[PDB]
Amino acid sequence: REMFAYAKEHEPCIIFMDEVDAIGGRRFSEGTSADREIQRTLMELLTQMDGFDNLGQTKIIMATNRPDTLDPALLRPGRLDRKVEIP
Amino acid sequence: LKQTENDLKDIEARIKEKAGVKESDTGLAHPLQVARCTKIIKGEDAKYVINLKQIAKFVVGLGERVSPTDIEEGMRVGVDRSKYNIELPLPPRIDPSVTMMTVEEKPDVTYSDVGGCKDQIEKLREVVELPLLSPERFATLGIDPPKGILLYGPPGTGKTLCARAVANRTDATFIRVIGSELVQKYVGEGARMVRELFEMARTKKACIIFFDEIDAVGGARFDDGAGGDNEVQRTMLELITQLDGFDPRGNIKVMFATNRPNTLDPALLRPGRIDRKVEFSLPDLEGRANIFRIHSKSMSVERGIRWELISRLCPNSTGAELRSVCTEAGMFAIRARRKVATEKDFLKAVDKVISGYKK
Amino acid sequence: KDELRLLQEPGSYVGEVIKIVSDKKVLVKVQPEGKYIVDVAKDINVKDLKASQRVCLRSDSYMLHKVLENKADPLVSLMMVEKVPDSTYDMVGGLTKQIKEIKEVIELPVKHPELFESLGIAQPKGVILYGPPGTGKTLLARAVAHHTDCKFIRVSGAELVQKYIGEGSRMVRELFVMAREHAPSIIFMDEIDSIGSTRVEGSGGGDSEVQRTMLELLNQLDGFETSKNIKIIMATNRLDILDPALLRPGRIDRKIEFPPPSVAARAEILRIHSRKMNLTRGINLRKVAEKMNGCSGADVKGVCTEAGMYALRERRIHVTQEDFELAVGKVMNKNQET
Amino acid sequence: FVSNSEILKPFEKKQEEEKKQLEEIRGNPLSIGTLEEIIDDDHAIVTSPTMPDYYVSILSFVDKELLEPGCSVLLHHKTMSIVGVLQDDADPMVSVMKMDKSPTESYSDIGGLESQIQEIKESVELPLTHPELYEEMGIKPPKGVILYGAPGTGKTLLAKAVANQTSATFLRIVGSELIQKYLGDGPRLCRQIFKVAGENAPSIVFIDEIDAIGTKRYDSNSGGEREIQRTMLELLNQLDGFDDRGDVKVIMATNKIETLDPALIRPGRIDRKILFENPDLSTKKKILGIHTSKMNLSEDVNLETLVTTKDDLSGADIQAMCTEAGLLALRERRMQVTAEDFKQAKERVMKNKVEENLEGLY
Amino acid sequence: DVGGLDMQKQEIREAVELPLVQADLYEQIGIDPPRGVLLYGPPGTGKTMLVKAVANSTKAAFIRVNGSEFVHKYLGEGPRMVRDVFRLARENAPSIIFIDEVDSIATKRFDAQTGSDREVQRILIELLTQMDGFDQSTNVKVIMATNRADTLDPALLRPGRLDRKIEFPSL
Amino acid sequence: QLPYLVANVVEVVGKAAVVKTSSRQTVFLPMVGLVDPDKLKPNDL
Amino acid sequence: ALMYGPPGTGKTLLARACAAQTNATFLKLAAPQLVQMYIGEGAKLVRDAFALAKEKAPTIIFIDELDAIGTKRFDSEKSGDREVQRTMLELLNQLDGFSSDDRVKVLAATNRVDVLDPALLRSGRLDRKIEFPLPSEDSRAQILQ
DSSP states (O other): OHHHHHHHHSSSOEEEOOOTTTTOOOOSSSOOSSOHHHHHHHHHHHHHHHSSOOOSSOEEEOOOSOSTTSOHHHHSTTTOOOOOOOO | OHHHHHHHHHHHHHHHHHHHHHHHTTTTOOOOSOOOOSSOOOOOOSOOOOOOSSSSOBOOOSSOOOOSSOSSSOTTOOOTTSOOTTOOSOOSOOOTTGGGSEEEESOOOOSSSSTTOSHHHHHHIIIIITTTTOTHHHHHHOOOOOSOEEEESOTTSSHHHHHHHHHHHHTOEEEEEOHHHHOOSOTTHHHHHHHHHHHHHTTSOSEEEEEOOHHHHOSSOSTTTSSSOOSHHHHHHHHHIIIIITSOSSSEEEEOOBSOGGGSOHHHHSTTTOOEEEEOOOOOTTTTHHHHHHHHHHSOOOTTSOHHHHHHHSOSOOHHHHHHHHHHHHHHHHHTTOSSOOTTHHHHHHHHHHHHHOO | OHHHHHSOOOOEEEEEEEEEOTTSEEEEEESSSOEEEEEOOTTSOGGGOOTTEEEEEESSSOSBOOOOOOOOOOOOSSOOOOSSOOOOTTTSOOOHHHHHHHIIIIIHHHHOTHHHHHHTOOOOOOEEEOSOSOSSHHHHHHHHHHHTTOEEEEEOTTTTOOSSTTTTTHHHHHHHHHHHHTOSEEEEEOSSOOSSSSOOOOOSSSOTTGGGTHHHHHHHIIIIIOOOSEEEEEEOSOOSSSOGGGGSTTTOOEEEOOOOOOHHHHHHHHHHHTSSSOBOTTOOSHHHHHSOSSOOHHHHHTHHHHHHHHHHHTTOSSBOHHHHHHHHHHHHTTTTOO | OHHHHTTHHHHHHHTHHHHHHHHHHHOSSEEEOOOOOOBTTTEEEEOOTTOOOEEEEBOSSSOGGGOOTTOOEEEETTTOOEEEEOOOSSSOSSSOOOEEESOSOOSTTSOTTHHHHHHHHHHTHHHHHOTHHHHHHTOOOOOOOEEOSOTTTHHHHHHHHHHHHTTOEEEEEEGGGSSOSSSSOHHHHHHHHHHHTTSSOOEEEEEEOOSSTTOOTTOSSSSOOHHHHHHHHHHHHHHHHOOOSSOSEEEEEOSOSSSSOHHHHOTTTOOOBOOOOOOOHHHHHHHHHHHHHHSOOOTTOOHHHHHHSOOOOOHHHHHHHHHHHHHHHHHTTOSOOOHHHHHHHHHHHHTTTOSSSSOOOO | OOTTOHHHHHHHIIIIIHHHHOSHHHHHHTOOOOSEEEEESOTTSSSHHHHHHHHHHHOOEEEEEETTOSOOSSSSHHHHHHHHHHHHHHHOSSEEEEEEOTTTTTOOOSSOOOTTOTTTTTTHHHHHIIIIISOSOOSSEEEEEESOOSSOOSSOSSSSSOOOEEEOOOO | OOSOBOEEEEEOOOSEEEEEETTSOEEEEEOOSSSOTTTOOSSOO | OEEEOOTTSSTTTTHHHHHHHTTOEEEEEOTGGGOOSSTTHHHHHHHHHHHHHHHSSSEEEEEEOHHHHSOOOSOSGGGTTHHHHHHHHHHHHHHHHOSSOOSEEEEEEESOOOSOOTTTSSTTSOOOEEEOOOOOHHHHHHHHO
């Protein structure tokens, strides 16, 4: 939230995320045992984008080990429109 | 006559307590676990008022300041668990409980649980009996005794009594520190007690300092880094520095005890901390043959029996469980109207404790 | 002008009298602070001070000022006592077996307490409901404290426990204080309920702090206080992570199950909810329940809203017989949809 | 009244001057503190419920023998010094203490539990009546007894049955009350158990239902409490350190011993582990006599007929058997329960436990 | 703003715009409106933005609530806010409460997880009490979006307080 | 006054600073000339 | 520099020899201290390691039992290793913070190398793998002498 507000107050800001597989992932049965922090981060990233306040000039770069192990809800258009491999 | 003198202590002295005590207690004022003042501001210099409470913490800089008795307000002046800057001299860590341990000089117990196990005896004869007898030969030998002795295995099996057996011929003072009583809710007392061990050991030499169940308090835990209490951290600083560097180990020895050897402090696993390691195993038929003969010497029973058959009825088990067998020997004999334990009395006594373990 | 001088006050705390001191003082426990020995008012004799008596202690001089009314002011989370409960047994009616088991447990000792003492058996002080989820027990919960003319009270064990210092105890003990003065009342125990009204499947990991308090107050109320006409009503369909000792006497007394649903069970329920609606003469309500599959009491209750939507598109207050079967087929398929 | 009118009345008039000097030190704004440690230099530690931990000086009011560490005292807002001690008569110092001298339960009234009597008699009555038998063997008779099963039959009857023949005072202490509401009272309550029963000691201490304090887990934090370790560590030293001729006795009760602290067990001090035995025809009639006393029954109702054919139920199902029999009379609107209700309710409870044991095994 | 939603648009108009505009149609027929609706489908695609479009035609206050909120180490504050937001919407009749991905907060515990997991079943009783506990009166519209759900039916399914269940059409 | 209050400076606009005390209280104070912007950092006295 | 081999070959003994000739501060990271009952302690532990090495420039960090915290495999079972997972993630983040300081050394003495990684092999990280085999015939003669 504070990063979302700091990006709106200060336009020249670039956010870079590294190894989001720890905060992301489908896990196994989609159940939660000490897992509440994984869903806590993912749900906030998707909720700030589809709200009435969007980010016009703010760019957020995410990185992970595999794209297929992430949340498919983020890969759909309307929030994350850029999927680019790095060979 | 004496009725007036009884109340006189609470009457005549109360008049002096009005002016005298209230003046000494002015400023909103022997183990003390909380050092804090209330709204005390003086000056610049001679202010201090260090507060350990979460609200309104303070620190004092500008070099070193040492006072013999009164620093600022006297009394509640203290440090406790959080060391604030430069002031050592007045810790409120003194608890006159330091006699809680057991100090036995020249123990009269020679063979109790030690008999029957050959391997554990010979390992402790070279590093204990010899230096406590003729330490001068080790100065000519060129090497030094090990800085620590690792004893791991089942507790209460004679691991502690094995140190008392070797100390008998050398007439060494046996000092045992029980890990159960070592763990206390007071933070900061463990650093003082360990420091007083080496200071007192220099007064009377030829002593052995033993520690029981070190894993109770632990050599390595998750409360050191994550937690806010300092106990084992300051204990290891006083354990390694005091003993190893300036203190000769000839007349001063430190022996620990534990169960799982891999759960100890990894700092001790490095070279230069603990060298001698002795492994304890369950006694066999020959190992338990001499154990029941020693315990039966105190009690009065029939001498025409054989203890090698009694030890054969019970399988391999910890030596701490063998003591409960002797307590059951003099019981079933009463049911048979026998003041002493006959040969048939030990038959039903051993078979009773075997089914109780359910192993 | 005289009111302006009265509006200036240093303030006064709130406490309760504990005991009486021969020194012309009194020990009063201040709820936000603690137990403090204060002075008794000069215009109020010390003989009028009773146990747990609500009084007023000044903030400035820390002493008794006057004697207010005697009551325990509740801290309100979900536990506020309501007024004029609105329900009836004719709305949830149609279940013959369940009503007979509720009356002989809850309502029986309230109306005639002498039947248990003369027979030689203790009156049941609690009952645990059994059955599938969503049988319509949410509406009859208001009628339990209504027809019996008791005080409506709901208790949430989660909101009365906080990690703050002193906030996980005084809240729980507040329920025990008012339960004695409100004694002609029925206490509702939630958050353990698996019956399906509100079903969280119980909480075994969040109650670790409250088990040291609430479980002591519930057992001490029956045993030590011997206060009758107080019904502690719990619910669940399974005991696994809860207290294993509930089977002992003093907690579980009677067990009310639920009758198996059938045509005759849903035939009376559909007729009750259709009284507020308007049906064309010649429609059989018993044939509607025959085509239903796995429908509980709440499944039939939801058909009323769906049945009125088809007739609203045509803008008619009277629902034709054609729209009922089309609505029931949609409600029955809600669980089997996709 | 008449005698004290010429004694106490002129006494209070001459003692009024000393009371005036007291009230000046007392003061109107008092407060309740908490003691920690008492030293001979007239100093102590006090705390008000807002937790401003202080250190003050002890004045002269009452003798120091009335002051004990871990108690509550009176304070004043000036120097926060102790102006007096709070009366402990209202607030119980221990957890649960019930002194029963020469109880009703005996060895012959508990039924077919005699198999358990022979074990407890040798570890309790034998060292008390003939202490010289253990002196020849040089052994320490175990003072502890470990009980198994459910209360109301094995634990309830045998607890008070051992005190009758031994002429001992029965003290019942709740095991779930070992952690009591306050920090620092752990070692205090452990000594008060042996102190009150240590002066005379015709008594046997009884403890039951410990599901918690016997478990210290892996630490004292992250869900654990420090009060748990204060009582457990002090109980081990008081039980192992104190030795006698068999007067003082401490008996606990637990359903599962695997969760208890093995260091607290201290093998060799307590050698007595008593299992649970099923009740015979004699014990089952004792449980029925309590409930059927107030329960209405005709002349054809006999306690021997009900116990003849039974699944050998515990104390919980036997109590529920007479409970279901009362519901048959309430549904029929009658205050007199016939003999058919006891037989009908007996079959229902019997079928709710063991019937065919999932018939099988070829 | 997005076509092909007529399947969902007809469901929202009946469960939102219908009780808000004309309240007399229910008293004439003798039926009561539902207190909420469950939406099943991917958020952000013809779903989440459509929910914000409801406040345009209804002119109602939209309450945005995330299932990842109310995260704290204490207790009693989380379950208290569920009751407070309901009474907050009672004063203003044009109010709408929305919950994004209720699947995270609707997951129960089949086994005891001891620490830090105790807050999943503590928050569920309050959402059910504000609906199943009270009678049927609508001062606000409750909409809970679900991206994916295997089985979560604590009290939620069956038409006790919630009748219609909206599903995102794939075809 | 030598015993200063223990706190942490969360923010070094240019002459304004924000400090967070360990008492769970947050106050606002202007920057003085006896300190430097690089010397004010959290996790420090 | 990566170091692997059986214990007793001098992997933990020679760690102080590099800091003694270079006048560097020896900082040891204990293996069981990396296992914490609290979740999320790996972030503050790594940040405080380089924070102390920032004030004192000649500081060498020694890591014990690299294989314990060095294997995530490919699996989803990391829920129990979740504290270990973010430990290696923060290690890659802090080493990228300051690329101008070569006086902070990271040394890990372990038994062997099993799970590789393209992130672990690069500048400012473990590069040269120096094997610590068992001493030969003439090697044991010099050690015993």
